[PDB]
Every structure is written in C-alpha cells, then in structure tokens.
Amino acid sequence: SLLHLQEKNWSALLTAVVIILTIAGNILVIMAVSLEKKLQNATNYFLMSLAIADMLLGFLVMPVSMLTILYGYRWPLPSKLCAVWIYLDVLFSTAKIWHLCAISLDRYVAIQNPIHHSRFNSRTKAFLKIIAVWTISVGISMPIPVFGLQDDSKVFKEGSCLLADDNFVLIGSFVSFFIPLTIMVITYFLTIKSLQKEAADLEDNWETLNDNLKVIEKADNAAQVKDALTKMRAAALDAGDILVGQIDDALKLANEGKVKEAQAAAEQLKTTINAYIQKYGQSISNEQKACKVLGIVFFLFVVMWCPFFITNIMAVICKESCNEDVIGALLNVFVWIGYLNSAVNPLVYTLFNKTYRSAFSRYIQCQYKE
C-alpha cells in the first residue's frame, strides 16, 4: 500500500508562507502596472507579465508541490494530472527566463536605437513581444504533456510525480535555459557598456563646450570666435536641434566680424548648455540606476534556481555513481529555493523603486485613486 499522509509538517507551515508572499507580492506588481501611470513603459509591462507568471506559479504549482510533501512525495492526484503539473511548473519558469532575456534584449536595442524606442513605445508593440514569448514558452514546454501523458514512465519515478525522462531534462536545460541565459548575460553586459560609453561621450562634449566658452570670452578676432563656435556647433550635434540655431545665431555674428557682439551671444548659450547637460546627464544616471535593479532581478533568478539546475543535471550525469535518494532529497529543497524567487521579484521593486513602493503602500491602505 502507498499514498500515505505523514508528519512532514515543519514543511507544511514553511511552504504555506512562500505561497502567500508569491501571490500577495505579484498581485501588488500587477496592480502597480495596471493602475500607476509612472509605470507605463515596455520594461514595466514585461515585469507585470513576469508577475502574472510568478502568481500563477503560486496558485497552480506550489500548492500541489506542497501537497506531495504532505503525502510523503507519493503522488495523491490522478496520474494524468502529473504531466499537467510538470507542464505548468516548467511553462511558468520558461516564461520567466525568456521574459528576463527579452527585457535585457529590449533595453539594449532601446539604447542602440533611440529613434526606434520612440516608435517601439507602443503598448501594442510591448504586448506583441510578450505574446511572442508566451507562445515560445508554450512551444518549448509542449513535449511534457504530448509525450508524458502518453507514457507515465516519462513523468513518474516510482509513485513520485517528477520529470523522470532524461532527454527532457538535458535538451530542455540547454534549449530553454542556456540559450536565453546567454542572450541575457551578453546583452546585460553590453547594456552596461553602451551606458558607460555614452556617459563618457557626454563628459567629452561637456568639456569641449566648456573649453570653447573659455576661448570665445578670451578671443580678439572674428576668426578665433568663428572656429570656436564651429567646434561648439559640431560637438553640439554630437549630443543628438534646440541649441544649434542659437549657435548659428552666434555664427553669423562671427561671419560678419561682430566679435564683442558674438562673445555676448555665447554667454547666453552657457545656461542653455547647463540645462541640456543636467537633463541628458540625469537620463544616463536613471538608466544606469534601472539597469542595476534589473540586474538584481536577473542575478537572483540565476542564483536561486542554480542549486536546482546543477543537481538535476548531476542526477543525469551520475545516473550510476551517486545516491539517487540524496539527489532526490536535495532537489526537493532546491525547487523551493527557486520557488522563493517568485516572492522576491516584488520585494526588489519595493526596496529600489519609490514608484512601486508608494503604490504598494496605498493598496495596503486600500487607496487606488493615484
């Protein structure tokens, strides 16, 4: 006889906590993007869809995962509900990683194509990209019901419902989890470098505009102002229209010979430059702030699923050499480290965004009026 309820009830109280923090955390994120209007961009739109994936993992996968621990890891439901539960577990995790990849991808293309980002601002464009990812994730996870329902040996390992098939655990791990992991760690690295270069390029054009504002207010002739405005106008085009015609206003005074009159115009440009420099120089500050926080989302996904990901692959490499009972007893812990990651995507936003933090606080006092 089997399917016995046991006294594994340290686990029952601990796993219940993780389910609510997932469900309550990611509901507040879905409510934040749906209601708060400082969050209406493509990156925050993905984070909602990430939190829909996290929350449905809290509803559908994590209670059943708890329920198995309550019946000694012998599987209490119907046997054709084993292959459904693996399919949802793997679908929500595959949808998370391909979101996290696609954010880091969409963020990088936003910097290399500033003009394209204005065109790609559309919520419809964002939703199309999400709907690309979910239908990729349903595409990748689809062997688990199509084959597993047909053969109980691919989803049961001795009354235990788990992905027993080893070509599913191997090929899936590299198709669905190092192809979008590669693209995430390449494009996060290059996003840091594109915002390092353009911050470094703005300090270049800060010091050459500030250098020619020394030159014009020293100068004697209309050739030492004309050249010095020609080097301002060229290196003001390198920060892109607003200021160029005001330099062209100053350029025609140097081209006629009105030097004291061209020098006075250049002093009027000074404050125009400090306005346009404090603006775009706070823009790079904000993107590098956002890139840092999205990195913590990216880093904690990778770290918390990493003990589950390595040990599941060591189940397949030492299929002979190792304690299958100990590897089975570690994966049962290691899956819940990765489940816990559904609870921490919301908490990150709270610590690191005052817009998410304010919104969460108001909803806890039941205040939706923005």
Ligand X SMILES: CCCCCCCC/C=C\CCCCCCCC(=O)OC[C@H](O)CO
- Binding residues for Mg ion, per CB under 5 A? 207, 211
- Residue from 72, 76, 145, 328 touching ligand X (CB under 6 A): that is 145
By beta-carbon proximity to ligand SRO, the closer residue of 155 and 195 is 155
- Any contact of residue 316 with ligand X (CB under 6 A)? no
Tokens of residue 223, six digits:
């050739």
**Phi, psi (deg, nearest 5) at residue 161:** -85, 110
Please, which residues have CB within 8 angstroms of residue 339's CB and are 6 or more apart in sequence? 18, 22, 57, 61, 62, 65
Q: What minimum distance in Å lies between the beta carbon of 299 and ligand SRO?
A: 21
By beta-carbon proximity to ligand X, the closer residue of 103 and 253 is 103
- Any contact of residue 328 with ligand X (CB under 6 A)? no
Q: What minimum distance in Å lies between the beta carbon of 238 and ligand CLR?
A: 41
User: x/- site string to ligand X, residues 273 to 312, per CB under 6 A?
Assistant: ---------------------------------------x
Please, which residues have CB within 8 angstroms of residue 305's CB and are 6 or more apart in sequence? 93, 337, 338, 341
For the chain, what's the residue count?
Answer: 370
Pick from 79, 30, 34: which is nearest to 59 by CA?
A: 30
- Any contact of residue 60 with ligand CLR (CB under 6 A)? no
Tokens of residue 307, six digits:
């003990």
Could you say which residues in the range 56-85 bind ligand SRO, by CB under 6 A?
Answer: 65
**Residue 42 to residue 39: CA distance in whole angstroms:** 9
Q: What minimum distance in Å lies between the beta carbon of 370 and ligand X?
A: 20
Residue 84 CB: number of other CB atoms within 10 A?
Answer: 18
- Residue from 144, 195, 343, 348 touching ligand X (CB under 6 A): that is 144
Q: What minimum distance in Å lies between the beta carbon of 78 and ligand X?
A: 4
Annotated binding-site residue? 26: no
- Residue from 28, 57, 84, 86 touching ligand SRO (CB under 6 A): that is 86
In one letter, which amino acid is 253? L
HSE, side-chain direction, 13 A CA sphere, residue 114:
9
- Residue from 47, 88, 90, 269 touching ligand SRO (CB under 6 A): that is 90
Q: What minimum distance in Å lies between the beta carbon of 173 and ligand X?
A: 5
H-type helices in the chain, by residue range?
9-35, 42-60, 62-70, 82-112, 114-119, 123-141, 143-148, 166-175, 179-218, 223-237, 244-256, 259-317, 324-352, 354-364
Q: Are 69 and 5 in contact (CB under 8 A)?
A: no
Residue 366 contact, options ligand CLR, Mg ion, ligand SRO, none, Cβ 5-8 Å cut-off depending on partner type: ligand CLR
Tokens of residue 48, six digits:
């909602």
Q: What minimum distance in Å lies between the beta carbon of 142 and ligand SRO?
A: 15
- Residue from 50, 335, 348, 359 touching ligand SRO (CB under 6 A): that is 335
- Any contact of residue 270 with ligand X (CB under 6 A)? no
Annotated binding-site residue? 312: yes
Q: Known binding site for serotonin: residues?
A: 89, 312
Residues lying near ligand SRO in the complex (CB under 6 A): 65, 86, 89-90, 162-163, 331, 335
